[PDB]
DNA sequence: CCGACCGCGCATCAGC
DNA sequence: GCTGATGCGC
DNA sequence: GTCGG
């Protein structure tokens, strides 16, 4: 908020290039400089000013100057009125519709909410889901909701095994006062780097929360990782709580820290971390920290005690989960 | 100026 | 039936 | 789009 007039406007040029353009690269670009920028103490009063950010060069820095002397920007305001881009804007929040099938589908003529109810036949089981929940998933839980969900799941786990750990990461570990989603860590011990002794131990907790009448609906099922919805149950009949996206990925418990450490985030915080790890000689995985010596092929995956244990490796001060929401 | 911008799991589909 | 390319969300 | 090289 302190400069929340730039970073808005390069966070929506940001998802211009991205679901219009198709320009990844374009896209980093603007959160990285959009976050660099949100973390800087003092306000913004130049253009000048913000190209001595890291991440931040001259042609953000001109146009932050043409924000500061109009409030507005002619690029974003013609884009606005743009309907091809508005529309393929509109058409990616639908979860599992990315920028090439909204792209597909205005060229099609299908542009609208009610469009894509119309051609539901043309649409896969992750776009419908998208659809049916599409104004319930861009609501956003409460820190309190997500507690009461926190001890549903990790008491439902350990129904089914109590040699089960979850551990809820994502945006709630970062201490968030609201949250997007739900992301669940899951560790079962006979589940490690070297082999799998016990099979369908994801498929087992995800059947087990859907008897309890948590998880609604399925986006994604595999052995390892599960993309689903969920939702709190109400009683004496009031207003049902609105559905909620969750994720679950199951992992070796051998490699539970540095997934601790990639699942908990933030993506732009995890993106810093691995870049400045090849910067002193190690590559940084969902799974695991190998050292890189000369031959640029990553080495055997090194001991690691802590999530700490990885911040030491590559000399970096300790950071809580607090302040890793970047 | 210039190339490098992370890497994973799952689903879908074309081609066989 | 299968494998590989690709899209998608992260 | 940015920046290290
Ligand atoms: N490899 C990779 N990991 C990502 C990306 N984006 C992203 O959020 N993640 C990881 O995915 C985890 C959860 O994703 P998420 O969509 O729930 O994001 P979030 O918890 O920070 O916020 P939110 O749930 O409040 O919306 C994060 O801890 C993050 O490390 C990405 O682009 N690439
Ligand atoms: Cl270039
Ligand atoms: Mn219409
Ligand atoms: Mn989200
Ligand atoms: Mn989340
Ligand atoms: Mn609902
Ligand atoms: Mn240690
Ligand atoms: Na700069
Ligand atoms: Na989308
Ligand atoms: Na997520």
Same mark, same amino acid.
Not at 93 to 97: D, F, L, W
Not at 120 to 124: A, F, G, I, P, R
Not at 214 to 218: C, H, P
């Given at each position: 908020t302190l400069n929340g007039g730039i970073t808005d406007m390069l966070t929506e040029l940001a998802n211009f290039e991205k679901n219009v353009s198709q320009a990844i690269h374009k896209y980093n670009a603007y959160r990285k400089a959009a976050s660099v920028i949100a973390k800087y103490p003092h306000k913004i009063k130049s253009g000048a000013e913000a190209k %001595? +950010?890291?991440?931040?060069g001259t042609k953000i820095a001109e146009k932050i100057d043409e924000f500061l002397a109009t409030g507005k920007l002619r690029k974003l305001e013609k884009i606005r009125q743009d309907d091809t881009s508005s529309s393929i804007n509109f058409l990616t929040?639908?979860?599992?519709?990315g920028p090439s099938a909204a792209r597909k589908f205005v060229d099609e003529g299908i542009k609208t909410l009610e469009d894509l109810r119309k051609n /539901?036949? %043309? +649409?896969?089981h992750h776009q419908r889901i998208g659809l049916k929940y599409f104004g319930d998933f861009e609501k956003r839980i409460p820190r309190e909701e997500m507690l009461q969900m926190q001890d549903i799941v990790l008491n439902e786990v350990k129904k089914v095994d109590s040699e089960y750990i979850a551990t809820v990461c994502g945006s709630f570990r970062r201490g968030? /006062?609201?949250?997007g989603d739900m992301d669940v860590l899951l560790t079962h011990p006979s589940f490690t780097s070297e082999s799998t002794?016990?099979? %369908?131990l994801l498929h087992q907790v995800v059947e087990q929360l859907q008897k309890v009448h948590?998880? $609604?609906? $399925?986006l994604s099922k595999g052995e390892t990782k599960f993309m689903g919805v969920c939702q709190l149950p109400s009683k004496n009949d009031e207003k049902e709580y609105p559905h909620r996206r969750i994720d679950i990925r199951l992992i070796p418990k051998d490699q539970y820290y540095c997934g601790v450490l990639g699942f908990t985030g933030s993506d732009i915080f995890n993106k810093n971390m691995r870049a400045h790890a090849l910067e002193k000689g190690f590559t940084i995985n969902e799974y695991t920290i190998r050292p890189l010596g000369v031959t640029g092929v990553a080495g055997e995956p090194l001991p690691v005690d802590s999530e700490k244990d990885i911040f030491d490796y590559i000399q970096w001060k300790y950071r809580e989960p607090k302040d890793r929401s970047e």
């Open positions: %001595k +950010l890291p991440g931040v929040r639908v979860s599992g519709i /539901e036949d %043309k +649409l896969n968030a /006062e609201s949250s002794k016990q099979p %369908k948590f998880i $609604t609906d $399925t």
